[PDB]
Amino acid sequence: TQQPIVTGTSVISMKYDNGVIIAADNLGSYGSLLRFNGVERLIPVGDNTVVGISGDISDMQHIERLLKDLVTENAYDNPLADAEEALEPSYIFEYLATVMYQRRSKMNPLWNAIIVAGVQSNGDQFLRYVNLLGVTYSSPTLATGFGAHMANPLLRKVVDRESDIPKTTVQVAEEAIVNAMRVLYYRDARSSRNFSLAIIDKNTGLTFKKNLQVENMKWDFAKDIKGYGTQK
């Protein structure tokens, strides 16, 4: 029975009208020590999905290899596979849902919180959760780990329910994920300034933006705090 040794914390995601955003800090925290820098959570799979993986970096690597063999699996025995039996986010999710459970049943849990975000080739927004209790649910907005408690309410203003999707656009959604990051940077210890942010659209395709920096920086209110409660 594995325990987390090194862990990623927080992937945030949301739905918008023509596709989805998935984003996460880049960090492999070895507990209290911020051990590893430049660790990349977001792995493109096929070209219409990004799967983000938080939790044990040790389990992550293993999941990365399984994901790469799923792409390779689709090529094998197919005359083509870029629109014939092209790899959808949903197929990937189902392949993962089964293995996390199977492993849970053998009592060696893949210790992860996973969000699969993508778009289908049917025009359908896909965004769904799986984790190491093998629990699954579909929801319009998702977040894992610390970020569930913290950042997910904030996105829930932007989209509460599934009839405010057509009234939210790509510039606005992008804006909301970055303000969500700012907040994870401030108020979470295993969150770095470094972050990656991927936009999968069914029209624009994959945009993977790497090494963005938190901005809109508030620290200039800090000189007016003097003492702990009573101190002149």
Next chain:
Amino acid sequence: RNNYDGDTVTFSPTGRLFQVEYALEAIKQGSVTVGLRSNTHAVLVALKRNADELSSYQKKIIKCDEHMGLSLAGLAPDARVLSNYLRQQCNYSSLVFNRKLAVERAGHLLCDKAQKNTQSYGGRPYGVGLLIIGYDKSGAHLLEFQPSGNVTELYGTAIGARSQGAKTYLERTLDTFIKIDGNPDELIKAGVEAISQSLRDESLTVDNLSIAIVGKDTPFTIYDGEAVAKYI
């Protein structure tokens, strides 16, 4: 010579094995079927044969899954096995990958299934020919499975006894049934013609015809008895 036909682990000087050609013959010894298809529907029409007229036929269509199904030609003991495994692969895809299994890949696992007993001593190449029809993402398909394991994507083919006359009906009219779409009845009309040329010393009955159809919005359905009396 033919002292070499008693083992399937022995080759001939003419670069054959004898057991595999003999397994080919075994198809012919059984009933007759004609497959043909259109871009938005796939159809098998198969002759049911009975032992005597108190005997009430043999079911020649085995429904695989709700997007695939197949007909048999040759020995029945053999067919029940091959069918079972194939159904198992369609249910595996539906559970673990949330997919309707492609006709092309499914046919290809069967080719691999055939070679497992060909190589190993004991067991035999199977003595039944299968025509698999299905409707996936890449639309309608008709595959011709062979004892050898040669799998052939075709617009129309026929196997069994005196099946060369169906291929002559299908060859003349090849381009005509490709152009039919949206009308299942008319693919059935073409099939009914086809299986007429195959017969010798017989005439079609409401219980000789067994007509099997899968298409775009129609799942796999097997018509029998009083559902084949609109096209008798």
